Design a protein around this ligand. Structure first.
Ligand SMILES: [K+]
Ligand SMILES: [Mg+2]
Ligand SMILES: [Mg+2]
Ligand SMILES: [Mg+2]
Ligand SMILES: [Mg+2]
Ligand SMILES: [Mg+2]
Ligand SMILES: [Mg+2]
Ligand SMILES: [Mg+2]
Ligand SMILES: [Mg+2]
Ligand SMILES: [Mg+2]
Ligand SMILES: [Mg+2]
Ligand SMILES: [Mg+2]
Ligand SMILES: [Mg+2]
Ligand SMILES: [Mg+2]
Ligand SMILES: [Mg+2]
Ligand SMILES: [Mg+2]
Ligand SMILES: [Mg+2]
Ligand SMILES: [Mg+2]
Ligand SMILES: [Mg+2]
Ligand SMILES: [Mg+2]
Ligand SMILES: [Mg+2]
Ligand SMILES: [Mg+2]
Ligand SMILES: [Mg+2]
Ligand SMILES: [Mg+2]
Ligand SMILES: [Mg+2]
Ligand SMILES: [Mg+2]
Ligand SMILES: [Mg+2]
Ligand SMILES: [Mg+2]
Ligand SMILES: [Mg+2]
Ligand SMILES: [Mg+2]
Ligand SMILES: [Mg+2]
Ligand SMILES: [Mg+2]
Ligand SMILES: [Mg+2]
Ligand SMILES: [Mg+2]
Ligand SMILES: [Mg+2]
Ligand SMILES: [Mg+2]
Ligand SMILES: [Mg+2]
Ligand SMILES: [Mg+2]
Ligand SMILES: [Mg+2]
Ligand SMILES: [Mg+2]
Ligand SMILES: [Mg+2]
Lengths: 23, 123, 155
RNA sequence: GGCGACACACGUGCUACAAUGCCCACUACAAAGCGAUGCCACCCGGCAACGGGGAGCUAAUCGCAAAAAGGUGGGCCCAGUUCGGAUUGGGGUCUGCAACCCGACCCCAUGAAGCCGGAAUCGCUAGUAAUCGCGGAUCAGCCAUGCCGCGGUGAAUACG
RNA sequence: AAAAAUGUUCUAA
RNA sequence: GCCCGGAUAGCUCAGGGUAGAGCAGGGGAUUGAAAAUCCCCGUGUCCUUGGUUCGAUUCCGAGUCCGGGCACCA
RNA sequence: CGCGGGGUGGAGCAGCCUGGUAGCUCGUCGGGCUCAUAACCCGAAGGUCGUCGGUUCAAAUCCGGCCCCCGCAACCA
RNA sequence: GCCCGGAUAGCUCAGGGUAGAGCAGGGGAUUGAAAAUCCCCGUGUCCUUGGUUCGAUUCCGAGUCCGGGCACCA
């Protein structure tokens, strides 16, 4: 879910990037 | 009782089964398998007895798990409580530790509500 | 509405069957605006219905719809100050709406995992007189037959 | 230092309880805005936050930029779970004179309540509701899930 | 042709 | 005379580690100011004296001052 | 030390007879409706049963002493 | 001891070819609600055992328990 930061969905929510949502 | 001391559930893929071990999330499950040549899709039921011990050996030797991890987590809380730092008082009285406000929620840390009586109006 | 009637939004016939009754039913499967997903569901269920008991889907769909339209239902009243269950006949527009609504509602009751299967099976049962939406339609008609004593409180 | 307290109580919201869903990879289609100790292309280090290089743009030109839901392919198979992401341990990053009280982010681990909510109660009549994302003001940073805007997909119903 | 009681004192700007 | 039962703040009363309350009054919040309501405050050698106890306003005894009642007789 | 009855959430009453299970109405507290209060509606908490002792595996319940509180009786002379 | 009866869903009661109905309880429709109402839904060795019959609630026997009644008491 959007609250799960360790996912490509939660990173979109916080507007941030990481291993779980790279660019 | 197979690896480490927990029986990881059969019928599931091996990568999700290993997560049922305290100390292994999904990303560590990704490692151990790849570092040992076991198809992450293989069902636990369908692993060699050679693959059991190959998966087991790495898992149990690379990172510390179940009981020891809990003992080292407990040791650090205990350490913070012993020295008397502000985090130590939080873990004592049972209130949150990471800056969260307590006027409203904190229920995960406080537990069920303890409803009290309130101040009254005038008729 | 207070000043004038509400005018009926005439829907756009769908592209597979060219039918207006079909799109209203697609609109009832639709949630949070995802129409395309809600179109696949009806169509995946449709292909199923040509398999399970080979019959032209358009006919199995309308036969369920026709066997869910309730001819009567109870409504509320007021006369004196007492509110009973007054039976009143159902307008054709509302029959359609209750059917499609109960169809999906009946469908999502079922214990099947994929959506279109639940859609296919309820349409299959209802077009043969069984299933959730048919228990509901009959249930509504039976409650209205019960309160026929208060039919004189009809408007 | 406090405005962030916490036996409690209420309002407004965010996130959800899953399969019309979740996850990974591939691949499309916006609008309105902002941008000279500003926005940062691309490049190497790094699992990542970021760091170091380093073009272009005083901006219908260069940049923020990837829009997301969606479309395709594949994985999960009804489990408190590959649902949910609170709480907590450890390790970092960055702005800042300074992150103890009291920052945001990232990574390993931890993975709570929650199985659709009592009495009661709110909004919306159409490109509306619902859902999807995007930008701006404030601003070193930021507790924004708030506000002011922006488009994407797109219903149901009104007898009276 | 009517379920359902009540609203402290002074002040009415 | 003879038993039982009450003495604690200015009032009226609760009740083995010198103690409450309400009320009265003062101050705060509230109000336009009040009333009411909420908070805070000052409030006692707990009637004298003896005993038990490390320790008594609490448990016992007495002294004080009040209170509820017993009494020809055939 | 004449004979009875009684003591259990804050109030008033079950439960005792027949040992194992504490219950009912109001009240109290949190929410809701109302402009507000009451009524009303949804939730919740509070009683180791006067006391000491005995019987029993187990006592509010059974037995004995004490404390307290109402009721009856006290005739012939 | 004797005659008469009953036991049937949780409570009540109807019954050789069925296992029933009402109320209690479940949600749902209803109002502001307490309901009445409306709806659907469940809840049985019909006390146990033999025997009858093609079959068993039934009919029979026999015992279990609880109803009634009668008579008695040395
Ligand atoms: K005489
Ligand atoms: Mg997840
Ligand atoms: Mg694990
Ligand atoms: Mg805080
Ligand atoms: Mg609440
Ligand atoms: Mg919010
Ligand atoms: Mg809320
Ligand atoms: Mg941006
Ligand atoms: Mg869990
Ligand atoms: Mg649970
Ligand atoms: Mg999980
Ligand atoms: Mg930490
Ligand atoms: Mg800080
Ligand atoms: Mg579930
Ligand atoms: Mg809901
Ligand atoms: Mg309007
Ligand atoms: Mg969503
Ligand atoms: Mg900012
Ligand atoms: Mg915070
Ligand atoms: Mg925003
Ligand atoms: Mg009055
Ligand atoms: Mg005056
Ligand atoms: Mg004398
Ligand atoms: Mg006095
Ligand atoms: Mg004043
Ligand atoms: Mg003395
Ligand atoms: Mg004297
Ligand atoms: Mg004297
Ligand atoms: Mg005198
Ligand atoms: Mg008492
Ligand atoms: Mg009492
Ligand atoms: Mg009794
Ligand atoms: Mg008993
Ligand atoms: Mg009780
Ligand atoms: Mg209350
Ligand atoms: Mg007003
Ligand atoms: Mg009220
Ligand atoms: Mg209770
Ligand atoms: Mg006794
Ligand atoms: Mg007992
Ligand atoms: Mg006489």
């Amino acid at each position: 879910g959007k609250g799960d930061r360790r996912t490509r969905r939660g990173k979109i929510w916080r507007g941030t990037y990481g291993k779980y949502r790279p660019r | 009782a197979r690896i480490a001391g927990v029986e990881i559930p059969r019928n599931k893929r091996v990568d999700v089964a290993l997560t049922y071990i305290y100390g292994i999330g999904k990303a560590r499950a990704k490692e151990a398998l790849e570092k040992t040549g076991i198809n992450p899709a293989t069902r636990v039921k369908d692993l060699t007895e050679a693959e059991v011990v190959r998966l087991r050996e790495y898992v149990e030797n690379t990172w510390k798990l179940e009981g020891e991890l809990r003992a080292e987590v407990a040791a650090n809380i205990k350490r913070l409580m012993d020295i008397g730092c502000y985090r130590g008082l939080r873990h004592r009285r049972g209130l949150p530790v990471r800056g969260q406000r307590t006027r409203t929620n904190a229920r995960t840390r406080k537990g069920p509500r303890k409803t009290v009586a309130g101040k009254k109006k005038a008729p | 509405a207070r000043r004038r009637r509400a005018e009926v939004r005439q829907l756009q016939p769908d592209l597979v069957y060219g039918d207006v009754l079909v799109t209203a039913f697609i609109n009832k499967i639709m949630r949070d605006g995802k129409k395309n997903l809600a179109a696949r569901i009806f169509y995946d269920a449709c292909k199923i219905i040509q398999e399970k008991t080979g019959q032209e889907p358009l006919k199995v769909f309308k036969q369920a719809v026709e066997n869910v339209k309730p001819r009567m239902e109870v409504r509320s009243r007021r006369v004196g100050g007492a509110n009973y269950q007054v039976p009143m006949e159902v307008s054709p527009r509302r029959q359609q709406s209750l059917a499609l609504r109960w169809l999906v509602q009946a469908a999502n009751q079922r214990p099947e995992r994929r959506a279109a299967v639940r859609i296919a099976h309820e349409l299959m049962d209802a077009a043969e007189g069984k299933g959730g939406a048919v228990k509901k339609k009959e249930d509504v008609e039976r409650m209205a037959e019960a309160n026929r004593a208060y039919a004189h409180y009809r408007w």
